[PDB]
Design a binder for this molecule. Sequence first.
Ligand SMILES: NC(=O)C1=CN([C@@H]2O[C@H](COP(=O)(O)OP(=O)(O)OC[C@H]3O[C@@H](n4cnc5c(N)ncnc54)[C@H](O)[C@@H]3O)[C@@H](O)[C@H]2O)C=CC1
Ligand SMILES: Nc1nc2c(ncn2[C@@H]2O[C@H](COP(=O)(O)OP(=O)(O)O)[C@@H](O)[C@H]2O)c(=O)[nH]1
Length: 160
Amino acid sequence: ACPQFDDRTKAAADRGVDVDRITPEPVWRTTCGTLYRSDSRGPQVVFEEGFHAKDVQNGQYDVEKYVLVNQPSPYVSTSYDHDLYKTWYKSGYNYYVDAPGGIDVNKTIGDTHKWADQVEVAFPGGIQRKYIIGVCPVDRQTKTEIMSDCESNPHYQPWH
Ligand SMILES: NC(=O)C1=CN([C@@H]2O[C@H](COP(=O)(O)OP(=O)(O)OC[C@H]3O[C@@H](n4cnc5c(N)ncnc54)[C@H](O)[C@@H]3O)[C@@H](O)[C@H]2O)C=CC1
Ligand SMILES: Nc1nc2c(ncn2[C@@H]2O[C@H](COP(=O)(O)OP(=O)(O)O)[C@@H](O)[C@H]2O)c(=O)[nH]1
């Protein structure tokens, strides 16, 4: 149902992430369900580039510090929660992700911190475009997906 890979950065769009720098000790996600990412960039950009991390070389490698205060980091955030997009003022787009691995944030840093209801999975080195299923645009006023205008990613490559 869900293959496991020894490469902890299999999903990454940025190949140069050093997992030895990750702190604290990561607990890696081992399931393969759909994850979600709000991102204001539209699909003709995201489907082409994937989700690159902001600062792989010199960003905030401590997951706890990154989660508590957004800052440039080697991580791209996603959520187990389809509906997390509703908590954004301007989500723009709810991207659907089918990618192996990632750091399970609440398993790594606990589920009592500020923001634990984001049920986050942080991808070191981001998420290459072949692991992005598609997207639904989000209507800001109603905080709902505009389901008739969802789109598939032509580069999505199923792997399980
Ligand atoms: N986005 C999500 O669905 C999730 C976010 N989080 C957390 O929620 C907070 C808000 O997250 P985001 O909006 O994702 O913050 P972010 O700072 O990663 O992205 C904000 C905006 O920056 C732009 N952007 C991001 N990465 C880029 C890149 N490499 N190149 C160019 N433009 C880029 C996009 O317009 C994006 O909407 C953060 O603390 C994040 O860790 C937690 C769970 C899921
Ligand atoms: N984990 C985490 N979440 C944050 C942080 N700042 C804001 N958020 C949450 O991320 C979601 C999006 O907030 P923000 O990035 O300000 O975008 P906006 O709602 O579109 O203006 C909201 O639920 C915020 O409460 C942060 O530093 N860390």
